[PDB]
Amino acid sequence: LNASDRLLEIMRLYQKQGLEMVGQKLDSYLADKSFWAEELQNKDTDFGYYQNKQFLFVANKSKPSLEFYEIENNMLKKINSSKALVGSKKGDKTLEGDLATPIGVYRITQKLERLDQYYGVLAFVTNYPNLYDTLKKRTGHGIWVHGMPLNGDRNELNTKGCIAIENPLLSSYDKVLKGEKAFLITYEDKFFPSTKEELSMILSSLFQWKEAWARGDFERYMRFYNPNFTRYDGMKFNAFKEYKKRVFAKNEKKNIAFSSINVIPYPNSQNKRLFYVVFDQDYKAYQHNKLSYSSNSQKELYIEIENNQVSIIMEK
Amino acid sequence: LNASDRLLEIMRLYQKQGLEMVGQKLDSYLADKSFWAEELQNKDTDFGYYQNKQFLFVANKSKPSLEFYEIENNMLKKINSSKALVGSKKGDKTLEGDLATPIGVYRITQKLERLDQYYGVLAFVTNYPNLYDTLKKRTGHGIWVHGMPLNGDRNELNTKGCIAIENPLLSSYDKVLKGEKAFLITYEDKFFPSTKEELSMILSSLFQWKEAWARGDFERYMRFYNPNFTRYDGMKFNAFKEYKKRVFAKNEKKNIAFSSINVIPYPNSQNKRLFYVVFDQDYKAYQHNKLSYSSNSQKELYIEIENNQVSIIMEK
């Protein structure tokens, strides 16, 4: 079953039964692993799935090195790479002042340009501690990707956790970036890419979870949640399930849509198969066919694949 | 590839902008000649485009003969053919009692069975005079496809305009038809088939016209109409245009959907490239977001292609 068959089937449905049945068919594709497997088959998927154009930094703490990529239609283009300086402590960053460069997936939130000359041309600010770090109660702050001292001093072999590279290369990255946000994937010894099978399982599950949510299927929705689940505000599984039971019993109608979806393999010290999933969510709920609630938000999930099953370990 | 890209566009649109925008995108394909060119490329298109399953008699006045077809996904299955008795007058039927079998595209409206023995096992009633005949002021009635005398008489060489075939075969067609309406194409010496280019032009135009109508684009809508236009109720081009300018100035919201579209080459004296278009139409209009008018009707168009341009010459 291929893309041409699916297009023909969409149009046949549209001409014969109209628009509502088209939506139901499109939903069935989105919930279908094989549909994603086909879309992904010739794409560069090692660093994840990215719907829109994005920029990716990849840091190897061990070498140490930093690479920079552009990703468009899920095809990678390597811009450059170099050696880097990183923190002195091996493994996870878990505490303020532990001198460790964090392992995981981070976002570059801003550029700083009026800094001590030690930081070089600029500093890209990472969002350590990210949601995952925050729900694990890891402490610390101020992890940046920056340059080398402007005076030309080279008197350190390690930072206190920041990632530092040469200024000309750093400037060249900034010119490619043009003020766009970047992801940063940082790993330690060896990187374990997301496979096409894993991305296919996550994306199909993602849409199944959405539609179980929207239609108020409490049992199906709850099965996507890992027993260890933690919500962004600290709520754990039992209270979460209690609450959702009540909410779902109200049987309100909802429409939910996910866009700008990225799914990114998440390096971690236990080498669990973890992924960070981030997307825009359009959410609408109705009471007696009157719109009673709407929101547009940025959602974040952390998902594990274990025992060949997808589960949600954290959600904002 | 293209089908991969086209599908991806639809899937992204569905989640980013909604099912309504998906419908508009499918509509843009239906308005595109190259879309139809591709869609028709391996279809049996000589007798026209038939969206759903349909049945077709083809009568050659000159032979004389009658063929019967089943048409499913626009592939012809020929059920049978045989010799036939037809009217003695060559050329057009224009008048009550002129003994001519009419030339053009007709519809079988009903089956009669309580007949005089002369007429055989049954009569399929054709709709002579059709809309075209009627707007051309042609008169007469009772043009049937029927059998041979039940008392075994086989005297006559010609009917008074009906089409007569052997009773065993006629019953066979009836059992295949099973109460369904059928089309009849009748032509005189040589049949000049609808081509794939003609059909693709007519179909893309049909959907362009629908969009111009529904979105209220007066100038683009009026461009499809031939100067010689006659509406089913006699109204001519200038009065039609005047009335439409008024209606379009109201800028009412309108939703229009077509289904079971058939486009059938229309044989004619002058061998002009004329076609009969017939479809079901669901029409709704609104006033300040409230439904003010709805209808479900069978629409009929007669269309000429001349100097590579599609025009409407008659509409019901």
Residue numbers in the entry:
A (entry chain A), B (entry chain B): 15 to 330
From the paper:
To provide a structural basis of understanding the molecular function, the crystal structures of Csd6 have been determined, both in the ligand-free state (“Csd6-unbound”) and in the d-Ala-bound state (“Csd6-Ala”). Refined models of both structures are essentially identical to each other with an r.m.s. deviation of 0.17 Å for 632 eq Cα positions. In the case of Csd6-unbound structure, two monomers in the ASU were similar to each other with an r.m.s. deviation of 0.64 Å for 316 Cα atom pairs, except for the N-terminal residues (Leu-15–Asp-41) showing r.m.s. deviations greater than 1.0 Å with a maximum Cα deviation (7.6 Å) at Leu-15. The amino acid residues with the largest deviation encompass the entire helix αA and the N-terminal half of αB. In the crystal of Csd6, two possible models of the dimer could be identified. The dimer model I has a buried surface area of 1,080 Å2 per monomer (6.7% of the monomer surface area) at the interface, as analyzed by the PISA server. The dimer model II has a buried surface area of 726 Å2 (4.5% of the monomer surface area). After direct excitation leakage and buffer background corrections, the distance between Cy3 and Cy5 dipoles in the dye-labeled Csd6 dimer is estimated to be 107 Å from the corrected FRET efficiency (Ecorr ≈0.03), using Ro (Förster distance) of 60 Å for the Cy3 and Cy5 pair. In the crystal structure of Csd6-unbound, the distance between sulfur atoms of two Cys-176 residues is 96 and 66 Å in dimer models I and II, respectively. This result unambiguously favors model I, supporting the assignment of dimer model I in the crystal as the dimer in solution.
In H. pylori, Csd6 is one of the cell shape-determining proteins that play key roles in alteration of cross-linking or by trimming of peptidoglycan muropeptides. Csd6 is also involved in deglycosylation of the flagellar protein FlaA. A Csd6 monomer has a three-domain architecture consisting of the N-terminal domain (NTD; Val-13–Asn-56), the middle l,d-CPase domain (Lys-67–Glu-202), and the C-terminal nuclear transport factor 2-like domain (NTF2-like domain; Thr-209–Lys-330). Mass analyses using the synthetic muramyl peptides indicate that Csd6 functions only as the l,d-carboxypeptidase (l,d-CPase) and not as the l,d-transpeptidase (l,d-TPase).
